Ligand binder design. Structure first.
Ligand SMILES: *[C@@H]1O[C@H](CO)[C@@H](O)[C@H](O)[C@H]1NC(C)=O
Ligand SMILES: [Cu+2]
Length: 217
């Protein structure tokens, strides 16, 4: 149970919801649990108001950004970050409503010694790279942890989500893809989401990250 309110950019941490759309769990810190629900995208407190209540952070392609939670990410889970071009601007509720989301980063559990080994449950932040070859322009950045401690039943996986509003400058000329939509990218049946992390099936090959392949340039 945690929010992701602080964008990390230029080597510094922004204020709560300065660049991140305030999410509906701002008090409860509870997760999104329905991947068919519009909340799976940016978890906004109010779809029509919250984007306009959010500033837009200017960052350069190739620079390191990230997200800090309001506490340590103590559930075991899978982390990801998606970008979408944001038209007319990152502070619009129209931004990212289409299938323009592409994955740029993930931090999955790894299957070693017959058990899943998860990223640290004592960190309260994640960082990753805006692709150097990313075209300059405005983007939504969606960062999530899919917490898997009770994910053995359908809808048991827990999504903790924050969307930052970006102005990317000094970019490249790449063509990002594959693109997906939120909602749309997840069904809830993925072997990385509908998963018993404690009793893995006998022929378990390894953790399969959900969603599309990463684009890094
Ligand atoms: C990061 O630094 C660049 C260059 O100094 C600046 O243009 C940009 O506005 C900064 N972004 C922030 C502080 O979010
Ligand atoms: Cu929790």
């Amino acid at each position: 149970h945690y929010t992701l309110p602080d964008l990390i950019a230029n080597g510094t941490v922004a204020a709560d919801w300065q660049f991140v759309r305030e999410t509906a769990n701002h008090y409860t810190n509870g997760p999104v649990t329905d991947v068919t629900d519009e909340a799976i995208r940016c978890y906004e407190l109010d779809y029509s108001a919250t984007p306009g209540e959010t500033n837009i952070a200017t960052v350069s392609a190739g620079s390191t950004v990230g997200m800090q939670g309001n506490g340590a990410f103590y559930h075991p889970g899978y982390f990801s970050a998606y970008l979408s071009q944001a038209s007319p601007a990152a502070n619009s509720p129209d931004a990212g409503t289409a299938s323009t989301w592409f994955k740029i980063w993930e931090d999955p559990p790894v299957f070693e010694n017959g058990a899943l080994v998860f990223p640290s449950q004592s960190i309260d932040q994640v960082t990753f790279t805006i692709p150097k070859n990313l075209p300059s322009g405005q983007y939504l950045l969606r960062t999530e942890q899919i917490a898997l401690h009770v994910a053995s039943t359908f809808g048991g996986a827990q999504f903790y989500i924050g969307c930052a509003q970006l102005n990317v400058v000094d970019g490249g000329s790449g063509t990002p893809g594959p693109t997906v939509a939120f909602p749309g990218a997840y069904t809830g049946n993925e072997p990385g989401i509908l998963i018993n992390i404690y009793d893995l099936p006998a022929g378990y090959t390894g953790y399969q990250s959900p969603g599309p392949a990463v684009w890094q340039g």
